[PDB]
């Protein structure tokens, strides 16, 4: 069927939308080429719609079915807990889109009578009405990018009302947080922290006689997800031991919301109909991961690839297997893409066999190596800094709900560009505004957390280890990329940053407290007189577990 059907009504903005980076005295320190930074707007919606709209082709086979049963069998071991209206409400981000029923995020978190009561009525309805399609809202998402040799059309987000959202949590939060793991084990990418992911990729890579791996980019994954896929997805959830209410709610949500439903723009006008995956629902991350793993694992058997190892992150896939030779590999890969196309997962860019792990890009990032104080190699996860930087500039010129810059300092603390550009630039700004202890909200694997900037040394040591503060001698390839990128965006030369770092470090130390620990550990690269960085107390007294359990991107989750 058609992934989409449009009435003709326009995907309307919900207010004034900014596309150009505003000129702020602070933005220029980071990059001078501000006209290269742009935020997507609803004005490009039409372009997007044309690309995500199309008829799907899906042919299932014996391999698909075999793998499915293997996954169901494992799911069978799971027992899911129904969440209480209270627990579910506490998971709602304080800035989630208000309900069209006289209550918003605050009320929900404040267990407000109106909020709690509508949510109850919504839940009741999910238990009685097993058919009526639930209304969803469609918006053009605003995201910042750097123009590439033209621009990207806004992505489209579809989500149900706040009421519905809380009910989703009630019925599926425990499932989407534990099932993926139970079904895919070490293949579930969200169980890993950046360091653990690298560990998994390197271990998996060395365990091969002659390793070969590729990244498989699926063309607009969400729109390739079919009614069948989503029902196969539910069949897996139905294998869990569930409370009657939770079970009915999963069945009703599947038929009324997940398989598709009406689309309404911000003006309350009917826009069309969705017959594929919505981006703004709780099962998006879990469902795409399950669906992508199922298809790839089956495709691999079909393509006769040898000893495949999947690493799935929603719609993101990276496969590492036993090479059977250059030609054979190239052929098995094409066979794999065809198996995937039949399964309704056509490729965006054709996949390419990689024989060098650093060249494989998965989850918009790759594995690279540098050296610690001792001089021993240390592997870390990095990525092209273009978007992180572009956004960092946007987040400097304007106040923003989430802070990608902070989320990036955390996930990419070991990286050359994160330590030289982001830490320097942002700490220097925080001092200028006397706001080091002010908690900031940022997202890790889609879920929001409030983090105090001054706890960055502990966090980093905990997730990455002390080497993150001493890494040097990066790879030629990594150095080249960062350099090319920094020059492209017009970012101050190395020398300009070292000077700014020496100054920020000094300013920080002369404050003691947690602000001093930041100066010693984070900017230890600036000074010639290195420091014997020892373990940090607060670092061991940390529990960053919830951080890397599952994916919730689009699920509207917030961890208090
Ligand atoms: O391999 C290294 N090993 C150590 N350091 C020192 C260093 C660090 F260990 C960590 C930092 F947090 C900042 C640092 F200093 C490097 C510093 C820069 C560099 O690469 C260069 C070299 C010359 C210019 C530029 C450069 C800088 C800005 C714009 C254009 N080119 C770069 C860079 F983008 F960073 F990749 C490579 C290395
Ligand atoms: Mg974990
Ligand atoms: Mg895609």
UniProtKB/Swiss-Prot annotation:
<feature type="binding site">
    <location>
        <position position="316"/>
    </location>
    <ligand>
        <name>Mg(2+) 2</name>
    </ligand>
</feature>
<feature type="modified residue" description="Phosphoserine; by host">
    <location>
        <position position="42"/>
    </location>
</feature>
<protein>
    <recommendedName>
        <fullName>RNA-directed RNA polymerase</fullName>
    </recommendedName>
</protein>
<comment type="function">
    <text>RNA-dependent RNA polymerase that performs primer-template recognition and RNA synthesis during viral replication. Initiates RNA transcription/replication at a flavin adenine dinucleotide (FAD), resulting in a 5'- FAD cap on viral RNAs. In this way, recognition of viral 5' RNA by host pattern recognition receptors can be bypassed, thereby evading activation of antiviral pathways.</text>
</comment>
<feature type="modified residue" description="Phosphoserine; by host">
    <location>
        <position position="29"/>
    </location>
</feature>
<feature type="binding site">
    <location>
        <position position="315"/>
    </location>
    <ligand>
        <name>Mg(2+) 2</name>
    </ligand>
</feature>
<comment type="subunit">
    <text>Homooligomer. Interacts with non-structural protein 5A. Interacts with host VAPB. Interacts with host PRK2/PKN2. Interacts with host HNRNPA1 and SEPT6; these interactions facilitate viral replication. Part of the replication complex composed of NS2, NS3, NS4A, NS4B, NS5A and the RNA-directed RNA polymerase.</text>
</comment>
<feature type="binding site">
    <location>
        <position position="217"/>
    </location>
    <ligand>
        <name>Mg(2+) 2</name>
    </ligand>
</feature>
<feature type="domain" description="RdRp catalytic">
    <location>
        <begin position="211"/>
        <end position="329"/>
    </location>
</feature>
């Amino acid at each position: 069927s058609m992934s989409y059907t449009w009435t003709g009504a326009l995907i309307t903005p919900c207010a004034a939308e900014e596309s150009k980076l505003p000129i702020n005295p602070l933005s220029n320190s980071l990059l001078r080429h501000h006209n290269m930074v742009y935020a997507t707007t609803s004005r490009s919606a039409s372009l997007r719609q044309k690309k995500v709209t199309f008829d799907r082709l899906q042919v299932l086979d014996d391999h698909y079915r075999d793998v499915l049963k293997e996954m169901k069998a494992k799911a069978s071991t799971v027992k899911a807990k129904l969440l209480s209206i209270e627990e579910a409400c506490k998971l709602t981000p304080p800035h989630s889109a208000k309900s069209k029923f006289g209550y918003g995020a605050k009320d929900v978190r404040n267990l407000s009578s109106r909020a709690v009561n509508h949510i109850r009525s919504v839940w009741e309805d999910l238990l009685e009405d097993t058919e009526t399609p639930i209304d969803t809202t469609i918006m053009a998402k605003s995201e910042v990018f750097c123009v590439q040799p033209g621009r990207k059309p806004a992505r489209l987000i579809v989500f149900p009302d706040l009421g519905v959202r809380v009910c989703e949590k009630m019925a599926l939060y425990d499932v989407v947080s534990t099932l993926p793991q139970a079904v895919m084990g070490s293949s579930y990418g969200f169980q890993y922290s950046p360091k653990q992911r690298v560990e998994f990729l390197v271990n998996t890579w060395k365990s091969k006689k002659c390793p070969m791996g590729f990244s498989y980019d699926t063309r607009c994954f969400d729109s390739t997800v079919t009614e069948s896929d989503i029902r196969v997805e539910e069949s897996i959830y139905q294998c869990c031991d569930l409370a009657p209410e939770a079970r009915q709610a999963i069945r009703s949500l599947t038929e009324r919301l997940y398989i598709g439903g009406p689309l309404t723009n911000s003006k309350g006008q009917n826009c069309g109909y969705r017959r594929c995956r919505a981006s703004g629902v709780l099962t998006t991350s879990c469902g795409n991961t399950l669906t992508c793993y199922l298809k790839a694992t089956a495709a691999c058997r079909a393509a006769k690839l040898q000893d495949c190892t999947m690493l799935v992150n929603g719609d993101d896939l990276v496969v590492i297997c036993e090479s059977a030779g250059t030609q054979e590999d190239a052929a098995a890969l094409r066979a794999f893409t065809e198996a995937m196309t039949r399964y309704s997962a056509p490729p965006g860019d054709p996949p390419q066999p990689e024989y060098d792990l650093e060249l494989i890009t998965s989850c918009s990032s790759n594995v690279s190596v540098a050296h610690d104080a001792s001089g021993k190699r240390v592997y870390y996860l990095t990525r092209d800094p273009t978007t992180p930087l572009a956004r960092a500039a946007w987040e400097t010129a304007r106040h923003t709900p989430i802070n990608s810059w902070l989320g990036n300092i955390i996930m990419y603390a070991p990286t050359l560009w994160a330590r030289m550009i982001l830490m320097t630039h942002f700490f220097s700004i925080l001092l200028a505004q006397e706001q080091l202890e002010k908690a900031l909200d940022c997202q890790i694997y889609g879920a929001c957390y409030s983090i105090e900037p001054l706890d960055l040394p502990q966090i980093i040591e905990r997730l990455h280890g002390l080497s993150a503060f001493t890494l040097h001698s990066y790879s030629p390839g990594e150095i080249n990329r960062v350099a090319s990128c920094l020059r492209k965006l017009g970012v101050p030369p190395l020398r300009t940053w070292r000077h700014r770092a020496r100054s920020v470090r000094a300013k920080l130390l002369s404050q003691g407290g947690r602000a001093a620990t930041c100066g010693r550990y984070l900017f230890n690269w600036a000074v010639r007189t290195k420091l014997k960085l020892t373990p940090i107390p607060a670092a061991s007294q940390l529990d960053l577990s919830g951080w890397f359990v599952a994916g919730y991107s689009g699920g509207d989750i917030y961890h208090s």
